[PDB]
Amino acid sequence: PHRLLQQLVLSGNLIKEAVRRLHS
Amino acid sequence: KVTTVVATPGQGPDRPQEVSYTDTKVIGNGSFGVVYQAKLCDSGELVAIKKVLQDKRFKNRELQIMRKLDHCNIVRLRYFFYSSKKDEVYLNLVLDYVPETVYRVARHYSRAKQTLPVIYVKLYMYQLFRSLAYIHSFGICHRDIKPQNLLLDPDTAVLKLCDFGSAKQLVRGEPNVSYICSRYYRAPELIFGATDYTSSIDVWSAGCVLAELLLGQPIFPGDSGVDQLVEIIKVLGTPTREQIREMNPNYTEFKFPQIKAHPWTKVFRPRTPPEAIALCSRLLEYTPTARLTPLEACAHSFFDELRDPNVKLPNGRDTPALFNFTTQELSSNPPLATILIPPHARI
Ligand SMILES: O=c1[nH]ccc2oc(-c3ccncc3)cc12
Numbered sequence: 001p002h003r004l005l006q007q008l009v010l011s012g013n014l015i016k017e018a019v020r021r022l023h024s
Numbered sequence: 025k026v027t028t029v030v031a032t033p034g035q036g037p038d039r040p041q042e043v044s045y046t047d048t049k050v051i052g053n054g055s056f057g058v059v060y061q062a063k064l065c066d067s068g069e070l071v072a073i074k075k076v077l078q079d080k081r082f083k084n085r086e087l088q089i090m091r092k093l094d095h096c097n098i099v100r101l102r103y104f105f106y107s108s109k110k111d112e113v114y115l116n117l118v119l120d121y122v123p124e125t126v127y128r129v130a131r132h133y134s135r136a137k138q139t140l141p142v143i144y145v146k147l148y149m150y151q152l153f154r155s156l157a158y159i160h161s162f163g164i165c166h167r168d169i170k171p172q173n174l175l176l177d178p179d180t181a182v183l184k185l186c187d188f189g190s191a192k193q194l195v196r197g198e199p200n201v202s203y204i205c206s207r208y209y210r211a212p213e214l215i216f217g218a219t220d221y222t223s224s225i226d227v228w229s230a231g232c233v234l235a236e237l238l239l240g241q242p243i244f245p246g247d248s249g250v251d252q253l254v255e256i257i258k259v260l261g262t263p264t265r266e267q268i269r270e271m272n273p274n275y276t277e278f279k280f281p282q283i284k285a286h287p288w289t290k291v292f293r294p295r296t297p298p299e300a301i302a303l304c305s306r307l308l309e310y311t312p313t314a315r316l317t318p319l320e321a322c323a324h325s326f327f328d329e330l331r332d333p334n335v336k337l338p339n340g341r342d343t344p345a346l347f348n349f350t351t352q353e354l355s356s357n358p359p360l361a362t363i364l365i366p367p368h369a370r371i
């Protein structure tokens with residue numbers, strides 16, 4: 001999550017993915 | 025050996041002078057550089073020497089910051105000198121030596137499966153907030169607040185903030201790097217990629233230290249950048265659309281599952297002092313402007329015991345100086361001085 005975090009921020013899916021990883 | 029150098033006083037002068045030191049010993053090494061421990065020849069006083077590789081046609085941010093600062097809760101820059109691979113230049117920061125860190129003390133109790141005495145939690149955190157009040161009044165943001173950067177004199181319980189290698193004088197409108205601060209203590213706006221953040225990221229990190237002192241372990245132990253947010257969401261839930269805008273106006277997420285915050289009272293052990301939890305809830309806010317200022321944090325009810333005339337350290341000793349405030353330190357809210365300085369503290 002360095003390039004992954006960058007992607008998430010750029011694609012506007014950061015929270016969506018974090019919530020998914022909560023797992024859930 | 026006895027090493028003699030020409031070094032400039034961190035205070036100013038700034039007129040160079042011969043400084044001699046001995047008993048040189050490596051006590052730290054990283055990508056930043058090397059930290060030595062040494063003994064001054066005329067004083068016998070111990071010092072730390074931070075050696076950093078310097079871009080010779082540029083100025084050092086840490087040096088320029090360190091030269092401005094003079095505060096009982098900040099590590100004192102005694103001298104600085106340059107050396108000397110052939111054409112390579114190293115900047116040497118000569119600092120007052122302090123033997124312990126909040127990290128190593130907290131780790132001790134943690135490994136002993138017990139919590140740090142509440143009085144120390146008040147003492148260290150209050151001194152932390154003071155140091156922050158001080159540096160923020162210059163517009164300087166530390167950007168690396170963590171237990172490892174909080175030095176402790178174990179006898180006197182004096183805390184000194186150190187390691188200004190990430191610090192920056194923040195100017196509104198001028199962007200700042202987002203990938204900053206040690207992960208566990210990194211403010212959520214930084215994870216969201218904010219470049220227009222403020223000194224309130226230090227308050228978030230201070231809140232993380234507080235929580236860690238209460239838990240015996242980091243509150244948000246992320247395994248990565250994204251997982252760091254996962255950890256935050258477990259406690260705070262998801263941010264509102266308004267909190268997202270407040271954190272990073274350039275970030276947009278139209279759809280996401282909303283999650284409610286976990287109650288603060290269940291985050292901590294049942295016997296955690298309710299006032300410590302209350303303070304924590306006012307520091308660990310998504311909205312950067314909603315967090316307490318360091319001064320406001322100093323004036324919080326949780327630190328009431330520190331303002332009690334009869335307060336003592338568990339070792340019998342009197343507490344360090346807590347009320348020697350300056351105009352610079354009080355500048356964000358000058359009237360708070362009458363609450364911060366209790367009647368027995370005045371001259
Ligand atoms: O800036 C830093 N980066 C890493 C280690 C370190 O240790 C000190 C220090 C200062 C005073 N006494 C002991 C250690 C500063 C410092």
